[PDB]
Amino acid sequence: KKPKEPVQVPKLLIKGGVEVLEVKTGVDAITEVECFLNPEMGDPDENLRGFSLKLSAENDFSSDSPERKMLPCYSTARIPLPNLNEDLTCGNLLMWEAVTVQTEVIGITSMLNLHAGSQKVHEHGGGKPIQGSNFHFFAVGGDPLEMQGVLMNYRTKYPDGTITPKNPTAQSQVMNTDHKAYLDKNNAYPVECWVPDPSRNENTRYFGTFTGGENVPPVLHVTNTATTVLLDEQGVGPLCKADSLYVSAADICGLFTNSSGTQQWRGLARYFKIRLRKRSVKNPYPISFLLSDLINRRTQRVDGQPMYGMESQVEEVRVFDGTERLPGDPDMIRYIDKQGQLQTK
Amino acid sequence: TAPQWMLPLLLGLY
Ligand SMILES: [Ca+2]
Protein backbone atom coordinates (compact mmCIF):
# COMPACT_ATOMS: atom_id res chain seq x y z
CA LYS A 1 0.00 0.00 0.00
CA LYS A 2 0.95 3.66 -0.18
CA PRO A 3 1.75 6.19 2.57
CA LYS A 4 -0.34 9.24 3.36
CA GLU A 5 0.02 12.93 2.55
CA PRO A 6 2.47 14.57 4.98
CA VAL A 7 1.48 16.58 8.03
CA GLN A 8 0.85 20.31 7.66
CA VAL A 9 3.67 22.10 9.51
CA PRO A 10 4.09 25.91 9.71
CA LYS A 11 5.67 27.35 6.57
CA LEU A 12 9.04 28.97 7.18
CA LEU A 13 9.34 32.31 5.40
CA ILE A 14 12.79 33.65 6.39
CA LYS A 15 15.55 32.68 8.81
CA GLY A 16 18.32 35.10 9.71
CA GLY A 17 19.34 37.86 12.08
CA VAL A 18 17.75 40.93 13.65
CA GLU A 19 17.01 42.63 10.29
CA VAL A 20 14.71 39.70 9.45
CA LEU A 21 11.99 40.81 11.92
CA GLU A 22 10.79 43.62 9.62
CA VAL A 23 9.16 41.39 6.99
CA LYS A 24 5.68 42.59 6.07
CA THR A 25 3.71 39.44 6.92
CA GLY A 26 0.07 38.59 7.47
CA VAL A 27 -1.95 38.66 10.65
CA ASP A 28 -1.40 35.03 11.71
CA ALA A 29 2.40 35.20 11.53
CA ILE A 30 4.47 33.95 14.46
CA THR A 31 8.14 34.78 14.99
CA GLU A 32 10.75 33.12 17.20
CA VAL A 33 13.52 35.41 18.44
CA GLU A 34 16.64 33.74 19.84
CA CYS A 35 19.18 35.70 21.89
CA PHE A 36 21.52 35.59 24.87
CA LEU A 37 22.73 37.78 27.72
CA ASN A 38 26.24 37.91 29.06
CA PRO A 39 26.49 38.02 32.87
CA GLU A 40 27.96 41.23 34.22
CA MET A 41 29.82 39.76 37.19
CA GLY A 42 32.05 42.81 37.61
CA ASP A 43 34.86 41.77 35.21
CA PRO A 44 37.99 42.91 37.10
CA ASP A 45 40.26 42.66 34.05
CA GLU A 46 40.10 42.72 30.29
CA ASN A 47 41.91 39.38 30.66
CA LEU A 48 39.48 37.70 33.08
CA ARG A 49 36.02 38.57 31.77
CA GLY A 50 33.33 36.48 33.42
CA PHE A 51 34.47 36.41 37.03
CA SER A 52 34.34 39.00 39.81
CA LEU A 53 37.08 40.68 41.78
CA LYS A 54 38.22 38.89 44.95
CA LEU A 55 35.94 39.20 47.98
CA SER A 56 36.45 41.21 51.14
CA ALA A 57 35.86 39.32 54.36
CA GLU A 58 35.22 41.01 57.69
CA ASN A 59 34.91 44.79 57.45
CA ASP A 60 32.42 46.39 59.84
CA PHE A 61 28.87 47.45 59.10
CA SER A 62 29.81 51.09 59.66
CA SER A 63 33.02 50.63 57.65
CA ASP A 64 31.86 48.71 54.58
CA SER A 65 32.83 50.05 51.15
CA PRO A 66 32.78 47.55 48.28
CA GLU A 67 34.07 48.32 44.81
CA ARG A 68 32.21 47.87 41.54
CA LYS A 69 34.51 45.09 40.35
CA MET A 70 33.40 42.69 43.11
CA LEU A 71 29.65 43.27 42.78
CA PRO A 72 27.66 41.07 40.37
CA CYS A 73 24.98 43.09 38.62
CA TYR A 74 21.90 42.44 36.51
CA SER A 75 21.91 41.90 32.77
CA THR A 76 19.19 43.52 30.69
CA ALA A 77 18.38 44.21 27.05
CA ARG A 78 15.74 45.82 24.86
CA ILE A 79 14.89 44.04 21.61
CA PRO A 80 13.43 46.49 19.05
CA LEU A 81 10.41 45.11 17.21
CA PRO A 82 8.90 46.48 13.98
CA ASN A 83 5.63 48.38 13.90
CA LEU A 84 2.72 46.22 12.81
CA ASN A 85 -0.01 48.66 11.72
CA GLU A 86 0.99 49.97 8.30
CA ASP A 87 -1.30 48.03 5.97
CA LEU A 88 -4.36 47.16 8.09
CA THR A 89 -7.70 48.98 8.14
CA CYS A 90 -8.76 51.90 10.33
CA GLY A 91 -9.68 51.64 13.99
CA ASN A 92 -7.78 48.35 14.16
CA LEU A 93 -4.83 48.06 16.55
CA LEU A 94 -2.51 45.09 16.94
CA MET A 95 0.62 44.55 19.06
CA TRP A 96 3.14 41.82 19.79
CA GLU A 97 2.70 39.17 22.47
CA ALA A 98 5.31 36.97 24.12
CA VAL A 99 3.71 33.53 24.35
CA THR A 100 6.52 31.17 25.31
CA VAL A 101 10.09 31.53 26.52
CA GLN A 102 12.57 28.66 26.34
CA THR A 103 15.62 29.47 28.44
CA GLU A 104 18.91 27.70 29.10
CA VAL A 105 22.32 28.59 30.56
CA ILE A 106 25.31 28.39 28.21
CA GLY A 107 28.63 27.05 29.39
CA ILE A 108 27.69 24.88 32.33
CA THR A 109 30.10 22.04 31.61
CA SER A 110 33.06 24.42 31.96
CA MET A 111 32.94 23.89 35.73
CA LEU A 112 34.63 20.52 35.05
CA ASN A 113 37.84 22.52 34.40
CA LEU A 114 39.44 21.48 37.67
CA HIS A 115 42.98 21.79 36.26
CA ALA A 116 42.77 25.60 36.25
CA GLY A 117 44.00 27.93 38.98
CA SER A 118 41.63 26.43 41.57
CA GLN A 119 42.47 25.46 45.14
CA LYS A 120 43.99 22.05 45.77
CA VAL A 121 41.42 19.99 47.64
CA HIS A 122 43.74 17.64 49.60
CA GLU A 123 47.46 16.84 49.62
CA HIS A 124 47.65 15.38 46.10
CA GLY A 125 44.28 16.19 44.62
CA GLY A 126 42.45 18.02 41.89
CA GLY A 127 41.18 21.54 41.96
CA LYS A 128 38.29 22.61 44.11
CA PRO A 129 35.14 22.92 41.96
CA ILE A 130 32.83 25.92 41.96
CA GLN A 131 30.37 25.82 44.84
CA GLY A 132 28.61 28.40 46.95
CA SER A 133 25.60 30.69 46.95
CA ASN A 134 24.30 30.66 43.39
CA PHE A 135 21.39 32.65 41.92
CA HIS A 136 19.52 32.07 38.66
CA PHE A 137 16.95 34.51 37.31
CA PHE A 138 15.31 35.57 34.06
CA ALA A 139 12.48 37.93 33.13
CA VAL A 140 10.62 38.38 29.84
CA GLY A 141 8.24 41.26 29.36
CA GLY A 142 7.00 44.12 27.25
CA ASP A 143 8.02 46.63 29.93
CA PRO A 144 11.35 47.10 31.73
CA LEU A 145 11.72 44.99 34.84
CA GLU A 146 10.60 46.99 37.85
CA MET A 147 12.80 46.51 40.89
CA GLN A 148 12.64 46.78 44.68
CA GLY A 149 15.54 47.84 46.84
CA VAL A 150 16.20 45.63 49.85
CA LEU A 151 19.70 45.34 51.28
CA MET A 152 21.24 44.43 54.60
CA ASN A 153 23.78 46.85 56.12
CA TYR A 154 22.31 50.13 54.88
CA ARG A 155 25.61 51.92 55.61
CA THR A 156 27.48 50.21 52.77
CA LYS A 157 29.14 52.83 50.58
CA TYR A 158 28.72 51.95 46.94
CA PRO A 159 30.86 53.38 44.11
CA ASP A 160 29.73 55.76 41.39
CA GLY A 161 29.23 53.12 38.70
CA THR A 162 26.45 51.28 40.54
CA ILE A 163 22.98 52.79 40.87
CA THR A 164 21.99 51.41 44.30
CA PRO A 165 18.83 52.58 46.13
CA LYS A 166 19.25 56.13 47.36
CA ASN A 167 18.71 57.45 50.91
CA PRO A 168 18.82 54.17 52.86
CA THR A 169 17.48 53.97 56.40
CA ALA A 170 17.23 51.08 58.84
CA GLN A 171 13.98 50.20 57.04
CA SER A 172 16.02 49.41 53.93
CA GLN A 173 17.15 46.20 55.64
CA VAL A 174 13.46 45.23 55.53
CA MET A 175 10.72 46.16 53.03
CA ASN A 176 10.90 49.89 52.26
CA THR A 177 8.42 51.28 49.74
CA ASP A 178 10.63 54.25 48.78
CA HIS A 179 13.14 52.11 46.83
CA LYS A 180 11.30 51.56 43.55
CA ALA A 181 13.30 51.58 40.31
CA TYR A 182 13.48 50.13 36.81
CA LEU A 183 16.05 47.71 35.45
CA ASP A 184 17.14 50.12 32.73
CA LYS A 185 20.95 49.91 32.59
CA ASN A 186 23.24 46.93 32.10
CA ASN A 187 26.02 46.26 34.64
CA ALA A 188 24.70 48.96 36.99
CA TYR A 189 22.12 47.55 39.41
CA PRO A 190 23.89 45.07 41.72
CA VAL A 191 22.13 41.85 42.61
CA GLU A 192 22.66 42.19 46.37
CA CYS A 193 20.56 45.37 46.50
CA TRP A 194 17.66 44.78 44.10
CA VAL A 195 14.94 42.15 43.93
CA PRO A 196 12.19 42.26 41.26
CA ASP A 197 9.22 44.09 42.72
CA PRO A 198 6.40 41.57 43.30
CA SER A 199 3.66 44.21 43.17
CA ARG A 200 4.53 46.15 40.00
CA ASN A 201 5.47 43.64 37.27
CA GLU A 202 2.15 43.08 35.55
CA ASN A 203 3.55 43.02 32.00
CA THR A 204 6.63 40.86 32.67
CA ARG A 205 7.03 37.26 33.80
CA TYR A 206 10.05 36.65 36.02
CA PHE A 207 11.37 33.34 37.32
CA GLY A 208 14.08 33.06 39.93
CA THR A 209 15.60 30.35 42.13
CA PHE A 210 18.60 30.44 44.40
CA THR A 211 20.28 28.13 46.90
CA GLY A 212 22.42 30.08 49.34
CA GLY A 213 25.00 28.07 51.21
CA GLU A 214 28.65 27.90 52.15
CA ASN A 215 29.02 24.85 49.89
CA VAL A 216 26.05 23.87 47.73
CA PRO A 217 26.41 22.33 44.27
CA PRO A 218 25.19 24.16 41.19
CA VAL A 219 22.64 21.73 39.78
CA LEU A 220 22.05 22.81 36.18
CA HIS A 221 19.87 21.07 33.60
CA VAL A 222 20.40 21.49 29.86
CA THR A 223 17.55 20.47 27.55
CA ASN A 224 16.00 21.76 24.33
CA THR A 225 12.55 20.24 24.93
CA ALA A 226 11.57 22.28 27.99
CA THR A 227 9.12 25.15 27.51
CA THR A 228 7.80 27.90 29.78
CA VAL A 229 4.37 29.33 28.98
CA LEU A 230 4.08 33.06 29.61
CA LEU A 231 0.30 33.45 29.42
CA ASP A 232 -1.75 34.86 32.30
CA GLU A 233 -5.22 33.91 33.59
CA GLN A 234 -6.94 35.58 30.63
CA GLY A 235 -4.73 33.92 28.04
CA VAL A 236 -2.51 36.86 27.07
CA GLY A 237 1.23 37.10 27.49
CA PRO A 238 3.50 40.09 27.91
CA LEU A 239 2.24 42.68 25.43
CA CYS A 240 4.91 44.85 23.84
CA LYS A 241 3.45 48.31 24.55
CA ALA A 242 6.24 50.17 22.93
CA ASP A 243 7.53 48.08 20.05
CA SER A 244 10.15 46.55 22.32
CA LEU A 245 10.79 43.22 24.04
CA TYR A 246 12.58 43.49 27.37
CA VAL A 247 14.81 40.57 28.34
CA SER A 248 16.73 40.50 31.61
CA ALA A 249 18.60 37.86 33.59
CA ALA A 250 21.17 37.32 36.32
CA ASP A 251 23.03 34.02 36.67
CA ILE A 252 25.48 33.69 39.56
CA CYS A 253 26.87 30.15 39.51
CA GLY A 254 28.96 29.94 42.68
CA LEU A 255 32.35 30.93 44.06
CA PHE A 256 35.58 30.17 42.23
CA THR A 257 38.33 29.71 44.83
CA ASN A 258 41.81 30.72 43.70
CA SER A 259 45.12 29.02 44.50
CA SER A 260 45.72 31.27 47.50
CA GLY A 261 42.09 30.79 48.56
CA THR A 262 40.82 34.21 47.40
CA GLN A 263 37.24 33.58 46.36
CA GLN A 264 35.48 35.33 43.49
CA TRP A 265 32.17 34.92 41.70
CA ARG A 266 31.49 33.32 38.34
CA GLY A 267 28.53 33.70 36.03
CA LEU A 268 27.38 32.18 32.76
CA ALA A 269 25.37 33.45 29.83
CA ARG A 270 21.69 32.67 29.45
CA TYR A 271 19.90 31.66 26.27
CA PHE A 272 16.45 33.00 25.39
CA LYS A 273 13.98 31.76 22.78
CA ILE A 274 10.82 33.89 22.81
CA ARG A 275 7.84 32.86 20.68
CA LEU A 276 5.95 35.99 19.63
CA ARG A 277 2.62 36.52 17.91
CA LYS A 278 0.30 39.33 16.85
CA ARG A 279 -2.33 40.10 19.49
CA SER A 280 -5.27 42.25 18.43
CA VAL A 281 -5.87 44.87 21.12
CA LYS A 282 -8.01 47.98 21.58
CA ASN A 283 -6.59 51.48 20.99
CA PRO A 284 -6.42 52.97 24.50
CA TYR A 285 -5.61 56.54 23.42
CA PRO A 286 -7.87 58.26 20.86
CA ILE A 287 -7.22 61.72 19.43
CA SER A 288 -8.89 63.23 22.50
CA PHE A 289 -5.98 61.90 24.56
CA LEU A 290 -3.64 62.90 21.75
CA LEU A 291 -4.81 66.50 21.30
CA SER A 292 -4.71 66.99 25.08
CA ASP A 293 -0.98 66.22 25.15
CA LEU A 294 -0.34 69.18 22.83
CA ILE A 295 -2.09 71.48 25.30
CA ASN A 296 0.04 69.74 27.94
CA ARG A 297 3.15 70.67 25.94
CA ARG A 298 2.03 74.32 25.61
CA THR A 299 0.56 75.22 29.02
CA GLN A 300 2.64 77.33 31.40
CA ARG A 301 4.22 75.23 34.15
CA VAL A 302 3.10 76.53 37.51
CA ASP A 303 5.06 75.71 40.67
CA GLY A 304 2.46 76.06 43.37
CA GLN A 305 1.25 74.40 46.50
CA PRO A 306 1.32 70.59 46.86
CA MET A 307 -2.01 69.35 45.49
CA TYR A 308 -0.81 65.74 45.12
CA GLY A 309 1.25 63.19 46.98
CA MET A 310 2.00 62.69 50.66
CA GLU A 311 1.90 66.38 51.63
CA SER A 312 -1.28 67.01 49.61
CA GLN A 313 -3.72 69.82 50.38
CA VAL A 314 -6.84 68.33 48.78
CA GLU A 315 -8.92 67.50 51.84
CA GLU A 316 -11.76 65.52 50.28
CA VAL A 317 -13.04 64.38 46.89
CA ARG A 318 -16.64 63.27 46.43
CA VAL A 319 -17.58 61.43 43.23
CA PHE A 320 -21.22 61.06 42.19
CA ASP A 321 -22.57 58.88 39.38
CA GLY A 322 -26.32 58.35 39.38
CA THR A 323 -29.36 58.58 41.63
CA GLU A 324 -30.01 56.99 45.00
CA ARG A 325 -32.71 56.93 47.65
CA LEU A 326 -31.84 59.50 50.32
CA PRO A 327 -29.42 57.95 52.82
CA GLY A 328 -29.96 58.52 56.50
CA ASP A 329 -26.21 58.95 56.98
CA PRO A 330 -24.97 62.15 55.27
CA ASP A 331 -21.36 61.16 55.94
CA MET A 332 -21.77 57.82 54.17
CA ILE A 333 -19.28 55.88 56.28
CA ARG A 334 -18.31 52.51 54.80
CA TYR A 335 -16.06 50.79 57.33
CA ILE A 336 -18.04 49.46 60.27
CA ASP A 337 -14.70 49.21 62.13
CA LYS A 338 -11.68 50.81 60.49
CA GLN A 339 -9.62 51.65 63.57
CA GLY A 340 -10.38 48.41 65.40
CA GLN A 341 -12.45 50.05 68.15
CA LEU A 342 -15.27 48.21 69.97
CA GLN A 343 -13.59 44.84 69.49
CA THR A 344 -12.96 42.38 72.31
CA LYS A 345 -9.51 42.21 73.87
CA THR B 1 8.35 24.51 32.57
CA ALA B 2 6.72 21.94 30.29
CA PRO B 3 7.72 19.53 27.49
CA GLN B 4 7.49 20.67 23.86
CA TRP B 5 5.27 17.82 22.68
CA MET B 6 2.27 18.93 24.78
CA LEU B 7 2.50 22.57 23.63
CA PRO B 8 -0.52 22.68 21.21
CA LEU B 9 -2.59 21.07 23.98
CA LEU B 10 -1.73 23.78 26.51
CA LEU B 11 -2.31 26.73 24.18
CA GLY B 12 -5.47 25.17 22.74
CA LEU B 13 -7.68 25.63 25.79
CA TYR B 14 -7.78 29.41 25.35
CA1 LIG C 1 0.13 44.34 40.98
TrEMBL record, chain A:
Keywords: Capsid protein, Disulfide bond, Host nucleus, Host-virus interaction, Late protein, T=7 icosahedral capsid protein, Viral attachment to host cell, Viral penetration into host cytoplasm, Virion, Virus endocytosis by host, Virus entry into host cell. The keyword Membrane does not apply. GO terms for cellular component: host cell nucleus; T=7 icosahedral viral capsid. It holds the Pfam family Polyoma_coat. Transmembrane segments: none annotated. One of its GO terms (biological process) is virion attachment to host cell. It is found in: Host nucleus; Virion. One of its GO terms (molecular function) is structural molecule activity. Homomultimer. Forms an icosahedral capsid with a T=7 symmetry. Belongs to the polyomaviruses coat protein VP1 family. This is Capsid protein VP1. The lineage of its organism: Viruses, Monodnaviria, Shotokuvirae, Cossaviricota, Papovaviricetes. The gene is VP1.
